[PDB]
Design a protein around this nucleic acid. Structure first.
Length: 107
DNA sequence: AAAAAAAAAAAAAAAAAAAAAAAAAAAAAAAAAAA
């Protein structure tokens, strides 16, 4: 089942760049639900979410791709467990933001 | 607080109009021959 889920992550990393809006949105929700667990290649899928910052649209109904990407990365890398103070809230946020740019390419 | 209804968007198939290309017919011009 884990091998088939990894094949699924490999296919959803390609389906992120489709033309339908709801396909991209449910693909992003699937990758967020995978990375809420500790699936190994799921992080790779999250990297291909980062190139969804460019696809813009002035439609103004539902949630767009970038407006959903803000919420996805906010839940992933901009939160901490709520038993923390204000100080280590910012420390965990800054640790996640620093670790987001350690093993990074130019793109 | 949840469910139902209405509106908008998406996908597939079909139809209409315009543009381009092809074919046919008619007319005009030139040259040659005969009385």
């Amino acid at each position: 089942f884990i091998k088939e889920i990894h094949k699924s992550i490999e296919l959803i990393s390609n389906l992120l760049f489709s033309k339908n809006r709801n396909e991209v949105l449910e693909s992003m929700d699937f990758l967020v639900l995978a990375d809420a667990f500790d699936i190994e290649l799921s992080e790779f899928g999250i990297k291909k979410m980062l190139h969804l910052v460019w696809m813009k649209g002035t439609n103004d109904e539902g949630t767009s791709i970038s407006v959903h990407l803000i919420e996805c990365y906010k839940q992933l890398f901009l939160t901490a467990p709520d038993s923390c103070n204000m100080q280590e809230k910012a420390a965990h946020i800054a640790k996640n933001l620093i670790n987001l740019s350690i093993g990074a390419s130019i793109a």
